[PDB]
């Protein structure tokens, strides 16, 4: 049967980026140009491969990760890329082998009083390992004496609002993206592309 | 994005108080991990912190005014205020309402307050 | 109360060059430092936070390095929309603290 790739582009609702979703597609067969050509997609650059090869391409799994962010950080959902989200939400490796597709969700993620249900992890203190997801809240010591649970100057709760409204400017609206990751490993392939 | 709009008279007579208030129409003043704060600047001189404020968890103010300095936040308005007591010609500065936090991340547009009689 | 120092106090170059700013503190402060933009007459706008870290919107030419007490600003390839004041802050302590500024100088 089919591959289910419009549980993840047309779903609902999104994940916040710090907590990026992954749906794991394995044991189906997958329609991509039909699927790909539409336009209706702000941002589209693939890493690695040619989206017109994938049709005759069979991998062992493919990942489809699917978050929100902002205009101006759709840049950073990239290899080798640096700044907030590429080091402490959502990391790809500098051997990403795969694409990423993002389009303009102000009608869907944007509230005339702001929409602040979606976060980022703003303070880490060390970068995110590529493919890592961290949904840890413990509060960020950035002072000199240690915060144990306790909030304040040098204690900061590490996660962060985006506060979507529909007026701000395209760099401050909400993007959804979903990073589709090709797998291939020395087992049996299982998603072929037809 | 968070919007800070900042008002207030920009003329004040000496020893009198400074009063100036920051609407917020970019974040809920409640629902952010973000502190609320004021920074001035002296014409031709440097940046100087006066205060930050939370929702409910505390003030923090600089020791170098702290004195003189009140710093009140109100939600049903979305607003937070800064009142400079006895101000001087020393005082005259281009004052800022900033989302502060580690770093001052938003900035209201200034408002030039001149101390003169 | 933690003392911040900039070097160099007013600063000439052309457009395309590299630019480094520095900072310095009177005690340990980590990595919690900040970098910030002012254009004459508008308001401040960040570049950086904990040293090395890019906020979301900034040009890629910017970047930052430093822990404890030394502190760097680097502008790769300088743009004309780059010749502005450009500050340092601390959030380690309590009482925040500013650098006083370094203007960067248009060189004719």
């Known amino acids: 049967n089919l591959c289910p790739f419009g549980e993840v582009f047309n779903a609902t609702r999104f994940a916040s980026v710090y907590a990026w979703n992954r749906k794991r597609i394995s044991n189906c067969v997958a329609d991509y140009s039909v699927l790909y050509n539409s336009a209706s997609f702000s941002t589209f650059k693939c890493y690695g491969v040619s989206p017109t090869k994938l049709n005759d391409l069979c991998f062992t799994n493919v990942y489809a990760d699917s978050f929100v962010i902002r205009g101006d950080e759709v840049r950073q959902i990239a290899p080798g890329q640096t700044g907030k989200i590429a080091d402490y939400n959502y990391k790809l490796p500098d051997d990403f082998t795969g694409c990423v597709i993002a389009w303009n969700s102000n009608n869907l993620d944007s509230k005339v009083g702001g929409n602040y249900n979606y976060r980022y992890r703003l303070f880490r203190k060390s970068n995110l390992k590529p493919f890592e997801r961290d949904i840890s809240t413990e509060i960020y010591q950035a002072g000199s004496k240690p915060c144990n649970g306790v909030e304040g100057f040098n204690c900061y709760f590490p996660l962060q609002s985006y506060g979507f409204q529909p007026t701000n400017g395209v760099g401050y609206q909400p993007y959804r993206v979903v990073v589709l990751s090709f797998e291939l490993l020395h087992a049996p392939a299982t998603v072929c592309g037809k | 994005q968070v919007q800070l709009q900042e008002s207030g008279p920009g003329l004040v007579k000496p020893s009198e108080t400074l009063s100036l208030t920051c609407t917020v129409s970019?974040?809920?003043?409640?629902?952010?991990?973000?502190?609320w704060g004021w920074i001035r600047q002296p014409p031709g001189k440097g940046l100087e912190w006066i205060g930050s404020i939370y929702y409910s968890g505390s003030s923090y103010y600089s020791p170098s005014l702290k004195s003189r300095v009140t710093i009140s936040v109100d939600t049903s308005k979305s607003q937070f205020s800064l009142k400079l007591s006895s101000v001087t010609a020393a005082d005259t500065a281009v004052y800022y309402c900033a989302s502060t936090l580690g770093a001052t991340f938003y900035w209201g547009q200034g408002t030039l307050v001149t101390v003169s009689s | 109360d933690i003392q911040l120092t900039q070097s160099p106090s007013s600063l000439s170059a052309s457009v395309g060059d590299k630019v480094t700013i520095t900072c310095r503190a009177s005690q340990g402060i980590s990595n919690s430092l900040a970098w910030y933009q002012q254009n004459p007459g508008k308001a401040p706008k960040l570049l950086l936070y904990?040293?090395?870290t890019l906020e979301s919107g900034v040009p890629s030419r910017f970047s930052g390095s430093g822990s404890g007490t030394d502190f760097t600003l680097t502008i790769s390839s300088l743009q004309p929309e780059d010749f502005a004041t450009y500050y340092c802050?601390?959030?380690?302590?309590?009482?925040?603290?500013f650098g006083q500024g370094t203007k960067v100088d248009i060189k004719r």
């Open positions: 970019g974040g809920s003043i409640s629902s952010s991990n973000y502190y």
């Open positions: 904990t040293a090395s």
């Open positions: 802050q601390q959030y380690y302590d309590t009482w925040y603290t």
